[PDB]
Design a protein around this ligand. Sequence first.
Ligand SMILES: [Fe+3]
Length: 54
Amino acid sequence: MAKWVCKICGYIYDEDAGDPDNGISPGTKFEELPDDWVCPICGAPKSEFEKLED
Ligand SMILES: [Fe+3]
């Protein structure tokens, strides 16, 4: 699945990993994260993530 970078801190949202500590099971697509999900490291909004693909 896809990976997304937090353009603030460099955290990688890996869709394969999810973010279980913050309520997100492995395999959750970035688009499906709640609108108010934030980077677990720096707190940046979803707007601050870049999909890692051309
Ligand atoms: Fe971040």
